[PDB]
Amino acid sequence: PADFNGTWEMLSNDNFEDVMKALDIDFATRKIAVHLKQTKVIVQNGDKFETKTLSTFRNYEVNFVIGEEFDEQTKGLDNRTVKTLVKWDGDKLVCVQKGEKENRGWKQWIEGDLLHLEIHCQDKVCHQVFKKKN
Numbered sequence: 001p002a003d004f005n006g007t008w009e010m011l012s013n014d015n016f017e018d019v020m021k022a023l024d025i026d027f028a029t030r031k032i033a034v035h036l037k038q039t040k041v042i043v044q045n046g047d048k049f050e051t052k053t054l055s056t057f058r059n060y061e062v063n064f065v066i067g068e069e070f071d072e073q074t075k076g077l078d079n080r081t082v083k084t085l086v087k088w089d090g091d092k093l094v095c096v097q098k099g100e101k102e103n104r105g106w107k108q109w110i111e112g113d114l115l116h117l118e119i120h121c122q123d124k125v126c127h128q129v130f131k132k133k134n
């Protein structure tokens, strides 16, 4: 079983601008955001997840239990309300965010000491990789 617990520092971030544009985040904001390093802080207790996404610009928090749908407010991103549901795919997390934007969600997994995060909206996909610090 994967263990997502820890602090993970971004190594790479590809096609983030494509996803931000699909979310209608304006160009000025995309330009700021694409150049920032991010940190992911995760506390996992079995199916219970507390996560934080940190940057010098804005921070983002999302907490969930596997299989339990909840209202997510993407404040600081696109600031939309979505119905979010995260489930397992083997050792991987797969999240669907039901709402105004079509085909919105993300997929997260570990290979070794690297955390991978795929973020998708409409036909766009962003791939991020993070290295475990603690």
Ligand SMILES: CC1=C(/C=C/C(C)=C/C=C/C(C)=C/CO)C(C)(C)CCC1
Pocket (backbone or CB within 6 Å): 020, 033, 038, 040, 051, 053, 054, 055, 057, 058, 059, 060, 062, 076, 077, 106, 108, 117, 119
């Ligand atoms: C666009 C946007 C940002 C991106 C955050 C992303 C999109 C987080 C994805 C969160 C998920 C998938 C949960 C943890 O895996 C941050 C807040 C850095 C700065 C302001 C603009």
